[PDB]
DNA sequence: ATCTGTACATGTACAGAT
DNA sequence: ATCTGTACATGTACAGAT
DNA sequence: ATCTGTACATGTACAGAT
DNA sequence: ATCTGTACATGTACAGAT
């Protein structure tokens, strides 16, 4: 009852998405159109839309949008990178459009962004029909990322991928584990699908920087986040609703306003309540365990993992089993401790940050 | 008890399946590859396997067995047959054949005859043309006898006709997007093939939906994982698999039985799964009132006439015009018996 | 004259609005 | 309840290329 | 255009555990 | 008696090579 008025809150307006969509999609589509054009590096790149506005789980406003720009890249080797799991090197074996990206036959991530950066910077120079402007480069990120002022404030996420349709790298083979939830037919077939590689773009100065490429699952986490029941009829007109969605809108936003407080949460970001609930969602894979009346216990049941998860610093990416988003060297226990307490104090005063 | 061991008998053996199955995939990859391979009206043909041996309902034997040659074909008219539902004339390579389907299937069938005789490795023959059949019929004699049904179709690749948006009622059940995900592959058309001396039975088409059934009875839970490795074993293909012997059983014994099949027996289980939406009401240790509900749904099919394509709601494959009120009355005896006493007949 | 990448045309699940 | 905008999958038309 | 290679679903068969 | 786990077999989807 009372977390059902602040899924209210954060409930998106038509309005608001007609507006925002409108827009978000002139740019995109100038922006797709131009990659097409002449001797392009990236001529042929495909569109992907991703992330939670195509999910149906952006809370508060539709004011960030993120979208895939994939290439296909057959005949591919990986290196992977120090046996992460998560990060690879990409090397071609056939000496080529991505040939002033080469480097020795690997291919260079931080070359290869900084051309298709140019390209969107120029062509964004010639819109004149609205207020668009390119964020300056943000380190780790492997996005070109827009400030779209229409009137309101709207960022979109160009994101730069390569496409292999090749089988999974085995570090993946342990991970997604659904066989109990959506089962061994769905995860043969998500697993036929493709798989991307976004650049790693650090700053730390490490070696192989600039051509360490990141996995990338989100056109996978779309398709389950849409197909998220045991039973084929979740949420459909002629099936029961759950809470699945809604559980994870409310610690989306439990994130979203500790972080927009404090900066000690720098280091925590929406991925990784959305990797803590696939984990949930794997544990009670039952659709009665999301029911809608038990919203609370469930939006509990999900804090007291996520809680399990900072103290024991321990959250496995849900495709790369052996890689832990709550390593050391990624966040420090005292931000994990930090965030453990304010968690704990949300819980156990009525959610007052839910009232902000 | 008595059932398990039922489908004990009825179970297929490995021995048998692979030796029927390396023989019958011989055959059909050399007719496969006349179709093309020679220059023919039929270069664009391309293999649908279907039916209880590839649905993994077929029973007692591996000896029949069901392929579609289907041709895609862009820009075909449809009209409705007299408002029938599933029959259809077809309009605009094909040159030589309004598409009439007899003239397709006669060269069809030419190009078959002419490449059995091309085969000396295999003891197979070409059966007798049956008037109200589709297919080209192999009979392959390994130590064995085994039926292979090649069926011709056509492939269209728009909307469904009208006749089906009321088909397929999977929603409560498969759900929606099951729905229409199966609504948006294409839909076949094979040869109305009798001889009964109407109007314009030589240019009917029907529609066929084995491919759409296929996917059902493989993907034939509410939940996901039904009958997966990591799920539950529901009954609802040993279900098909019992009720299929009894009307094979009886068939068997009776010529007054002749009007019926199998495809009967699978269309009422289709609207008993729908009905009975819920995997629980399918668990192994129910397999006798989940039989015996199946049966009665049967009787009320036959008591009432009634039995309703379960992709074309307005063809009655129950009505008087089809299957005579007497073989229906017949019918219902009949298994109002074997359920009354038994099932003697499953002893034999 | 025919071929074909691009974009229109069609249908509907999702979920916000009324 | 019903009505409705967006996203998205797939079929098809045709200007411009050949 | 056609074909092989790969992965894993669907099965059966049987022994050891329940 | 059934359950579980391994071995054995065929079907089918699609990537990549030719
Ligand atoms: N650290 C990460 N590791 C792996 N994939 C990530 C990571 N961060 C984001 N992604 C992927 O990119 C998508 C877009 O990220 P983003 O930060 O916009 O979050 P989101 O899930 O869309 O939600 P929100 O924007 O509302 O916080 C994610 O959904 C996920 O698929
Ligand atoms: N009367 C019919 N109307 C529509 N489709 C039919 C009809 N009879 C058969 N079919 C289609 O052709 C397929 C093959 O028919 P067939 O008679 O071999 O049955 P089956 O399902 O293969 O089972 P079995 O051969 O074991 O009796 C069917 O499964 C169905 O898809
Ligand atoms: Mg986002
Ligand atoms: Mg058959
Ligand atoms: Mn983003
Ligand atoms: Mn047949
Ligand atoms: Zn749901
Ligand atoms: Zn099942």
Redesign the interface.
Known sequence: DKLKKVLDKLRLKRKDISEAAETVNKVVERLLRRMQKRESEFKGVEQLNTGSYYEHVKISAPNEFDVMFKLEVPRIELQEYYETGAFYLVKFKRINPLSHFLEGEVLSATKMLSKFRKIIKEEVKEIKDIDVSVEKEKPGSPAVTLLIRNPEEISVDIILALESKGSWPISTKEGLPI????????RTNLRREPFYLVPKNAKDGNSFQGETWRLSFSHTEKYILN?H?????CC????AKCCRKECLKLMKYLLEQLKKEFQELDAFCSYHVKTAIFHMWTQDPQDSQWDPRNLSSCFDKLLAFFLECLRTEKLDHYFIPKFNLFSQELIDRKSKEFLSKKIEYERNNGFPIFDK
């Open positions: 066989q109990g939830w959506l089962g061994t037919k769905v197909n029941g045991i039973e084929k009829t459909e007109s002629s099936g």
